[PDB]
């Protein structure tokens, strides 16, 4: 699948708002993932001791990780589909070291959409949400193809 330039622009125009405060958006997204799908937290040896939303909010280390995650995703989105070089290292680490199934990438995609929908109704109406969903679907499809090449069922 291939996004139109107009779809990419809807993606990039909400991402511009995320970038006013990537750390706060990152916290909201990972906390939403862990609350909606608690089994995902068990993939993180670094964070799985955290018991409550309050502890997650107070973790400086989690905040930092969420900045790394959203900046990596932002760099992918800014390539507007030309993201082979960015996906190689990410797919390798997430297949072989972290062992993240495609279903869990679906769950984080849901969390991203939920937070953007809550925080950004001015830039995240129906057409914009559709564009973001298409971008995240493209990302997951390309990662799933890389996962297979790398030897991981996903
Ligand atoms: C939008 C999707 C995602 C992006 C962009 C992303 C990005 C990253 C980045 C940039 C790193 C650090 C470098 C590396 O190891 O590759 C990382 C680490 C990691 N990711 Fe992801 N990630 C995503 C989804 C997920 C999901 C859904 C899980 C678990 C359910 C996960 C689990 C991990 C783990 C366990 C680490 C290592 C954390 C640590 O011990 O330092 N990732 N991720």
């Amino acid at each position: 699948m291939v996004l139109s330039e107009g779809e990419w622009q809807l993606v990039l125009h909400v991402w511009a708002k995320v970038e006013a405060d990537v750390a706060g958006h990152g916290q909201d997204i990972l906390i939403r993932l862990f609350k909606s799908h608690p089994e995902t937290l068990e993939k993180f040896d670094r964070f799985k001791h955290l018991k409550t939303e309050a502890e997650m909010k107070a973790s400086e280390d989690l905040k930092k990780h969420t900045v790394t995650v959203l900046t990596a995703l932002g760099a992918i989105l800014k390539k507007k589909g030309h993201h082979e070089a960015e996906l190689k290292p990410l797919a390798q680490s997430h297949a072989t070291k972290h062992k993240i199934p495609i279903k869990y990438l679906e769950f984080i995609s849901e969390a991203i959409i939920h937070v953007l929908h809550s925080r950004h109704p001015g830039d995240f109406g129906a057409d914009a949400q559709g564009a973001m969903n298409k971008a995240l679907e493209l990302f997951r499809k390309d990662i799933a193809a890389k996962y297979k090449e790398l030897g991981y069922q996903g």
Side-chain angles (χ1 to χ4, degrees), residues 29-30 33-34 37 39-47 61 65 67-74 76 89-94 97-98 100-102 104-109 112 136 139-140 143 147:
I29 290 167
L30 272 295
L33 175 62
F34 296 153
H37 303 283
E39 66 272 31
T40 62
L41 179 59
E42 299 315 307
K43 290 285 178 177
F44 293 83
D45 288 344
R46 180 159 166 208
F47 302 124
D61 191 49
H65 181 63
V67 172
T68 296
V69 170
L70 288 191
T71 300
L73 179 61
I76 290 161
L90 188 72
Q92 182 178 42
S93 64
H94 286 63
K97 182 172 191 187
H98 312 315
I100 308 307
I102 297 293
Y104 286 9
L105 302 182
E106 291 166 356
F107 294 159
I108 202 175
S109 298
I112 292 162
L136 296 174
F139 162 77
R140 294 196 308 272
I143 292 162
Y147 281 177

Side-chain angles (χ1 to χ4, degrees), residues 23-24 27 47 56 59-68:
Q27 290 176 118
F47 302 124
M56 293 172 183
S59 169
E60 292 292 344
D61 191 49
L62 176 59
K63 181 177 190 190
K64 288 179 219 299
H65 181 63
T66 77
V67 172
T68 296

Side-chain angles (χ1 to χ4, degrees), residues 2-13:
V2 179
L3 280 72
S4 67
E5 173 67 6
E7 289 168 334
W8 286 118
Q9 289 302 327
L10 294 170
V11 170
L12 294 173
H13 278 77

